[PDB]
Structure 1
């Protein structure tokens, strides 16, 4: 694993880029889920569907 991180650093291949991006999209999702839950509360299941 220490030889892998040395080979990454040489090639300039950020290993965690994919996990960083995933955590931004997952915080965006949790913001939109909060906005839809608020509209489903102020209008109701029957109305929104």
Structure 2
């Protein structure tokens, strides 16, 4: 009702303070996430070239 509304503004203040501190410290707060996204799509590329082999040859030949 209203307790959650005030908790939300408390955490809003906490987030706005955390972003100011991360800006002060030159901290990339999403570098881990961006790297995870860029290396997860590389896994997609190697999976695309890997499934070509299994589609072209089959499960028995692959094993």
TM-score, length basis structure 1: 0.94
- Structure 1 unaligned runs (5+)? none
- Which of the two has higher C-alpha Rg? 2
- Structure 2 unaligned runs (5+)? 1-14
* Aligned-residue CA RMSD (Å): 0.5
Q: Whose relative contact order is higher, 1 or 2, with alpha carbons under 8 Å and at least 6 apart?
A: 1
Q: Select the residue among 3, 15, 24 that pairs with 1:10.
A: 24
Off by >6 Å, runs of 4+ in structure 1: none
